[model samples]
Target: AQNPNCNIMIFHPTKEEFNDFDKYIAYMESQGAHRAGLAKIIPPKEWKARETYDNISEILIATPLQQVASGRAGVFTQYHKKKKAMTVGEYRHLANSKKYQTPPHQNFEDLERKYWKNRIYNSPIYGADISGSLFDENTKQWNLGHLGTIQDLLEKECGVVIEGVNTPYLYFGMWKTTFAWHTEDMDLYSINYLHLGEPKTWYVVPPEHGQRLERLARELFPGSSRGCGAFLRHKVALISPTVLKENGIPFNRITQEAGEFMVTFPYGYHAGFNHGFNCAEAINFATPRWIDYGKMASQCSCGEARVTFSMDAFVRILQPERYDLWKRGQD
Candidate 1:
């Protein structure tokens, strides 16, 4: 850290350690090992991109001709447009489902009922422009707009700018983003606003800071989610998307199926979902546009989509070290 406003380092131990060159090298190596182990243990990541969660983050090998964004764009997004798959039945179903809301306690039941009865049932998230009788499945009605609107309004009401949007950077998200705490909506703060049916899994972290974030949160939100990322210990799901941008670039992807993990930084490893045609509902967060809390760091601004953009920019800018072993399934 160079200055008061630019102070980024949180761990200034009694002595110097690790140094610069080895930090990224080790991280990338670890990621490669994880990729290999996961590939062997689970399923291969679907690398082709699309408008759904699959398109969010991916790494492709560029032949001399396909290296450019335009050349590889459509292919990565879609492999065979004409090839039809199973009837888009229910799209991606969550491995499990939980109806979540902070209680006013018992007041939560009244509040949730009122939310559906008064607002969302008729909305797109639940069943917009379509007859409920058309689908025989029984499910609670949802109102993405109401949920998203309320989320943004509360953040604004709290007066914190929410800092980053679809862009990549970790945030405590009301809790430290430890990999182990993968409870229902327990992984992210954005889940509160995500009614659009995102992939089941993703990562978390304290939102990126060009400098140390804890003191910064006190200067910003004073005592809320801002300080929480720091309070909770660092965890795995909230990794940097640093893997997203490496020239070594292993096969990376986020699928339409709810994944088990995701992250904020482009730390040369994992990926998440994107907003597009497959999206299950309307998406939003509190920001109308750019705000001071976000801009205070180099964090990017979110766009008119479901995920955060500010995070993407932050990932690219850092351009973390990339490793080759991820693609090979080794460290």
Candidate 2:
């Protein structure tokens, strides 16, 4: 749903032209996303990348869909090198008799075979830090205030700041069986959710493992085409600012937080990042929420926390879905 491909949304530029973003660095290298230590996405020219892209998602279903399994989790990290690799009778003849059977979703073609992931397609789609907080049952931490609307949609679709939201809560761990996640189908549209703990597994990896991780990253990042998906794996938790574990062992490094979270629009690969502590609980997701679709088009719960709204009738009934999600990003 984001094709500004010609950058024609001209003129009105005022919030200082949305803070002078260098035209989204040639728009995330023309869509491969580009990441490494994670580039900090841009969006300042007075912060205006409108055409609001129709608040992204009519078909809904979102998230870092094409991270190419974070480089195919290091290019076939050996399908998780040496450890319970493929068994259900060869993961059930992938893509036909549809074997590996990992998702429990209801639509989006079974969530692209349950997050079958892989992609580094230039990296920068981050807004992660899912649900902004957690420690469980109101223990303490809490924040999901929407990082300034996820830094205004990653500065209108990945210009750079490596995407923001260091705090507001994050946790990704605990669900077991070595936890897993993946994605595929070159197509995408997502809106996901889950608060404290749910996914311990969700894999679908087909599309021939996203063409063997895009043919091994075009033989080691040759000038960039940034392709690969059927999302590989993931499991984020704890105030995650791009999770890190390996004795450095960082997975929502907890302390009894609370304010429950898990709001996602992320699609494809979905893994329950297992970094343990109580063996699992924090876990979260992000990237989509126009306030949970305005709390599912309101049945209640608006302004003054709904005492039967009065302030000029709930801001005149919320100004037409904010001008219809800003004209669905300038139609």
Measured on C-alpha atoms, candidate 2 has an lDDT of 0.25
Number of the top lDDT candidate: 2
lDDT of 1 by residue, 1-331 (tens): 2222211111221112322312422343344422221111111243111234333222111111101111121111111112122112221221111222122324423432342232211111111111111111222122222233423433554453433433111111100001211111111122111222322223222223212323332343333334344222211122123322222222322222322222122111222222211222222222222232332322112211122323333223222221121112211
For model 2, residues 34-93, the per-residue Cα lDDT tens digits are 111011222223322122222221211122121112334323221122223222222222
- Full-model lDDT for every candidate: 0.23, 0.25
What overall lDDT, based on C-alpha atoms, would model 1 receive against the true structure?
A: 0.23
lDDT at 153 for candidate 1? 38
TM-score of 2: 0.21
Query: Each model's RMSD to truth, in Å?
Result: 22.4, 20.0
TM-score of 1: 0.22
Q: Where does candidate 2 have its weakest 10-residue lDDT segment?
A: 250-259
Per-residue error at 255 for model 1, in Å? 6.7
